[PDB]
Amino acid sequence: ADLGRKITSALRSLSNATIINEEVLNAMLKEVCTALLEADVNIKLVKQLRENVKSAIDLEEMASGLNKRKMIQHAVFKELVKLVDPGVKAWTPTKGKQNVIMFVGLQGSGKTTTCSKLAYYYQRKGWKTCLICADTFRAGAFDQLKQNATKARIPFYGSYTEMDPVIIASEGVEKFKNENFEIIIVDTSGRHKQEDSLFEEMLQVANAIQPDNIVYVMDASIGQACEAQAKAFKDKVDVASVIVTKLDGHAKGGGALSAVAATKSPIIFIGTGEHIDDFEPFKTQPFISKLLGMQFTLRDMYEQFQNIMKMGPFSQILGMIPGFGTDFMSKGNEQESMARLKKLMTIMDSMNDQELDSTDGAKVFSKQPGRIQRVARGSGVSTRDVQELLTQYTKFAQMVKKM
RNA sequence: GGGGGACCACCAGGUUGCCUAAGGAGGGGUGAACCGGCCCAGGUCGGAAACGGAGCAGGUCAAAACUCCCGUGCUGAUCAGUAGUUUAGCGAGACCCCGUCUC
């Protein structure tokens, strides 16, 4: 979210000036290239983007009569497309039946986190996922995967110390082909801080099973050293994809994105932190756009809050829409405003059908002050917080019936 | 957490009356608004945890209080007028005819 501010500052530097000449475009691209280099992005490819922008739109030829800065922002957006993502969306849905997808990461790339949290989105969309943990050389990560996975009702077939990921993955697939499942995600192990050594075993697994998709997990902390690895990743398996993880902990994600774009592949999923909810599919060009340029009852409010928290996760889509304004994007590192909503929902759950189905619950609570005091017995929140909720509901209903 | 006393309200259920014009050891419901108990999701408090406390939704009633019905005794009142019994006459009159007389 820093690169968008740095290029929005470059757009504000284009605006509010009465110059327009080649020097302003030069000084703006001098600030754009500085922002890309401070991300990580390679000065050769950035100067290639710059000379492509100049060869596309010079200012020596006269397209006489022209609204400016709009097609300039569009050309900068277009060249940042023609480098970050190769175009239209990478194919996210569930690819037919039984969906055998392989995952190979790196040591320290949050293999357990990615392989745990990718299943929740397909389970919420309505697709049955099954994880085969062939992480044979990580006995502790077996226990972390099981402790994080038993809260999600997922079957598991895999034992300890068989030393054969081929046999473990094959017996996993042939046992999850029993109850007619749909997605089979196979999580393979780590070795040697992988030089050239696990790809032989992964070719053995692929020759044994013949999977459908192969997705490799990459980090944002590596930066411009992703290229030599990605050459091997895209020469050994052609039909394969990337998941770039760990964005909020580093300032070097754009360099990894530029390395993947220079090695010419589309990216399906992306990770944005350590929490469960920090994964997003790719809406490629609108990600770059959102980055650069931005009778009502108590039961009715409770059900609308149910619908809003049902549209809950969704934060990179719902929070980056034009028309919001400045002074946001942190709100105290984004946690408590989503957390207190469930608390207010339980304060509303401390009400009965009469209070929730009456016409004006604030008027009913003003007529009967013991109804305010009855919420505090079962919600356990303070009566002051109940009264603050009722004043917020009163102002809310006033803004609704005036709205 | 382990134990010794003292007091209040009630229930089951066995004997009962210095008790009634009658006083069921009946059934049901709310148990709300903080004022009965139990199980207590989520949450909160204490704790490093195990776990435990106050306990909300929700469910529950042999045992806080309230209320309804049946039975009960007093008590007005309604219904069918059911029940088993209680003109005529007289005296005068015009003209004509018949005789007499005179000129």
From Swiss-Prot:
Pfam families: SRP54 (PF00448), SRP54_N (PF02881), SRP_SPB (PF02978). The keyword Amino-acid biosynthesis does not apply. One of its GO terms (molecular function) is 7S RNA binding. Residues 1-292 are annotated as: NG-domain. The NG domain, also named G domain, is a special guanosine triphosphatase (GTPase) domain, which binds GTP and forms a guanosine 5'-triphosphate (GTP)-dependent complex with a homologous NG domain in the SRP receptor subunit SRPRA. The two NG domains undergo cooperative rearrangements upon their assembly, which culminate in the reciprocal activation of the GTPase activity of one another. SRP receptor compaction upon binding with cargo-loaded SRP and GTPase rearrangement drive SRP-mediated cotranslational protein translocation into the ER. InterPro entries: AAA+_ATPase, P-loop_NTPase, Signal_recog_part_SRP54_M_sf, Signal_recog_particl_SRP54_hlx, Signal_recog_particle_SRP54_M, SRP/SRP_N, SRP54, SRP54_euk. Keywords: Cytoplasm, Endoplasmic reticulum, GTP-binding, Hydrolase, Nucleotide-binding, Nucleus, Ribonucleoprotein, RNA-binding, Signal recognition particle. Component of the signal recognition particle (SRP) complex, a ribonucleoprotein complex that mediates the cotranslational targeting of secretory and membrane proteins to the endoplasmic reticulum (ER). As part of the SRP complex, associates with the SRP receptor (SR) component SRPRA to target secretory proteins to the endoplasmic reticulum membrane. Binds to the signal sequence of presecretory proteins when they emerge from the ribosomes. Displays basal GTPase activity, and stimulates reciprocal GTPase activation of the SR subunit SRPRA. It catalyses: GTP + H2O = GDP + phosphate + H(+). PROSITE patterns: SRP54. GTP binds at residues 105-112, 187-191, 245-248. Gene3D superfamilies: P-loop containing nucleotide triphosphate hydrolases, Signal recognition particle SRP54, nucleotide-binding domain, Signal recognition particle, SRP54 subunit, M-domain. GO terms for cellular component: cytosol; endoplasmic reticulum; nuclear speck; nucleus; signal recognition particle, endoplasmic reticulum targeting. The gene is SRP54. It is an enzyme of class 3 (hydrolase). Belongs to the GTP-binding SRP family. SRP54 subfamily. This is Signal recognition particle subunit SRP54. It is found in: Nucleus speckle; Cytoplasm; Endoplasmic reticulum. SMART domains: AAA, SRP54, SRP54_N. Its EC number is 3.6.5.4. It comes from the Eukaryota. Component of a signal recognition particle complex that consists of a 7SL RNA molecule of 300 nucleotides and six protein subunits: SRP72, SRP68, SRP54, SRP19, SRP14 and SRP9. Interacts with RNPS1. Interacts with the SRP receptor subunit SRPRA. GO terms for biological process: exocrine pancreas development; granulocyte differentiation; neutrophil chemotaxis; protein targeting to ER; SRP-dependent cotranslational protein targeting to membrane, signal sequence recognition; SRP-dependent cotranslational protein targeting to membrane, translocation. The keyword Thylakoid does not apply.
